[PDB]
Scaffold this active site. Structure first.
Site, PDB file in Angstrom:
ATOM      1  N   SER A  47      57.828 -22.529  38.552  1.00 46.39           N
ATOM      2  CA  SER A  47      59.050 -22.150  37.850  1.00 46.39           C
ATOM      3  C   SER A  47      60.087 -23.263  37.788  1.00 46.39           C
ATOM      4  CB  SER A  47      59.671 -20.913  38.502  1.00 46.39           C
ATOM      5  OG  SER A  47      58.806 -19.796  38.398  1.00 46.39           O
ATOM      6  N   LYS A  50      61.012 -24.505  34.435  1.00 42.45           N
ATOM      7  CA  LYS A  50      62.049 -23.870  33.615  1.00 42.45           C
ATOM      8  C   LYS A  50      63.062 -24.879  33.101  1.00 42.45           C
ATOM      9  CE  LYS A  50      60.769 -19.530  34.709  1.00 42.45           C
ATOM     10  NZ  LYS A  50      59.506 -19.178  35.414  1.00 42.45           N
ATOM     11  N   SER A  95      63.816 -16.001  37.273  1.00 40.16           N
ATOM     12  CA  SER A  95      62.519 -16.641  37.056  1.00 40.16           C
ATOM     13  C   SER A  95      61.628 -15.783  36.165  1.00 40.16           C
ATOM     14  CB  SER A  95      61.828 -16.924  38.390  1.00 40.16           C
ATOM     15  OG  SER A  95      62.483 -17.969  39.071  1.00 40.16           O
ATOM     16  N   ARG A 227      62.765 -21.360  51.610  1.00 49.03           N
ATOM     17  CA  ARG A 227      63.003 -22.473  50.697  1.00 49.03           C
ATOM     18  C   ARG A 227      64.460 -22.916  50.749  1.00 49.03           C
ATOM     19  NH1 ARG A 227      60.697 -19.753  45.310  1.00 49.03           N
ATOM     20  NH2 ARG A 227      62.004 -18.099  46.210  1.00 49.03           N
TER      21      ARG A 227
HETATM   22  O1  LIG Z   1      61.726 -18.107  43.088  1.00 50.28           O
HETATM   23  C1  LIG Z   1      62.497 -17.119  42.998  1.00 50.28           C
HETATM   24  O2  LIG Z   1      63.726 -17.150  43.251  1.00 50.28           O
HETATM   25  C2  LIG Z   1      61.904 -15.805  42.553  1.00 50.28           C
HETATM   26  C3  LIG Z   1      62.646 -14.919  41.782  1.00 50.28           C
HETATM   27  C4  LIG Z   1      62.093 -13.721  41.371  1.00 50.28           C
HETATM   28  C5  LIG Z   1      60.796 -13.396  41.727  1.00 50.28           C
HETATM   29  C6  LIG Z   1      60.029 -14.265  42.503  1.00 50.28           C
HETATM   30  C7  LIG Z   1      58.643 -13.913  42.903  1.00 50.28           C
HETATM   31  C8  LIG Z   1      57.584 -14.021  42.002  1.00 50.28           C
HETATM   32  C9  LIG Z   1      56.299 -13.651  42.355  1.00 50.28           C
HETATM   33  C10 LIG Z   1      56.045 -13.164  43.627  1.00 50.28           C
HETATM   34  O3  LIG Z   1      54.782 -12.772  43.971  1.00 50.28           O
HETATM   35  C11 LIG Z   1      57.080 -13.061  44.543  1.00 50.28           C
HETATM   36  C12 LIG Z   1      58.361 -13.433  44.180  1.00 50.28           C
HETATM   37  C13 LIG Z   1      60.600 -15.472  42.908  1.00 50.28           C
END
Ligand SMILES: O=C(O)c1cccc(-c2ccc(O)cc2)c1
Length: 242
Positions: A47, A50, A95, A227
């Site tokens: 991501s 983006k 995201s 993170r």
């Molecule tokens: O990286 C971010 O901040 C973020 C935001 C929304 C959703 C997810 C996400 C996506 C897929 C998942 O299996 C677990 C979490 C990450």
């Protein structure tokens, strides 16, 4: 130039995890990291793509501005926040992969490739599906390359209009208080091993900017908060933030 401080490894060891934090002092033009080997180890951007994706869509008119609405396509997905209408700001905030997959298809395979070369972005390889190569295709980028790309964006030096770069930096806004401003983007790569988390961006201070780029192994979604938490523990240790 580049100095390694292994003491930071504790912040990863304290949580039985593995990863790298890379910091770059813009005033001093000096870089710092816990693991110079991993700092240059290239991974799928996921991501974090983006940012360049947003830049390319805006500069070609695929996205006209940060207010344009992108209607939910009605397909219910596992992440509720994705099941609603979005603009560039909220799409980046949550995201929202399906929106950026639609961007990519409209950008097109040809134009996507040239722009990523123009950006000197990672290995500049878009092999795979035009709408998923940053999640399970051939593109790779390291933390130090992320920082190098971000530095051009901050200074409006990427080969896209100043407007497109300003808009994306607006969309990158994550946190702001009386002490600092963070403009950054998260990443979570799961479709191909090794599973990792990204966090890339920069911390604006009154008189300096600290660009950062971190990734870490991410076997389960339970550690996604590490993170930012690990990055911030490092920023505090170095008295970059209180
Ligand atoms: O990286 C971010 O901040 C973020 C935001 C929304 C959703 C997810 C996400 C996506 C897929 C998942 O299996 C677990 C979490 C990450």
């Amino acid at each position: 130039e580049w100095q390694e401080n292994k003491s930071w490894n504790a912040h990863f060891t304290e949580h039985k995890s593995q990863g790298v934090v890379v910091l770059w002092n813009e005033n001093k033009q000096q870089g710092f990291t816990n693991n110079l080997k991993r700092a240059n180890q290239a991974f799928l951007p996921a991501s974090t793509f983006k940012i360049p994706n947003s830049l390319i869509a805006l500069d070609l008119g695929v996205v006209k501005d940060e207010h344009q609405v992108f209607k939910w396509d009605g397909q219910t997905r596992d992440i509720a926040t994705w099941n609603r209408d979005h603009n560039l700001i909220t799409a980046m905030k949550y995201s929202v992969v399906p929106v950026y997959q639609e961007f990519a298809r409209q950008i097109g395979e040809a134009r996507m490739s040239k722009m990523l070369h123009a950006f000197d972005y990672g290995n500049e390889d878009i092999s795979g599906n035009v709408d998923s190569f940053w999640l399970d295709g051939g593109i790779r980028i390291s933390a130090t390359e992320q920082i190098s790309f971000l530095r051009k964006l901050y200074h409006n030096k990427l080969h896209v209009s100043e407007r497109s770069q300003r808009i994306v930096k607006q969309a990158m806004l994550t946190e702001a208080n009386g002490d600092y401003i963070i403009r950054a983007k998260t990443g979570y790569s799961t479709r191909i091993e090794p599973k990792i988390g990204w966090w890339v961006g920069w911390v604006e201070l009154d008189d300096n900017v600290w660009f950062f780029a971190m990734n870490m192994d991410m076997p389960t979604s339970d550690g996604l908060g590490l993170r930012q938490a690990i990055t911030k523990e490092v920023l505090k240790q170095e008295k970059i933030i209180p």
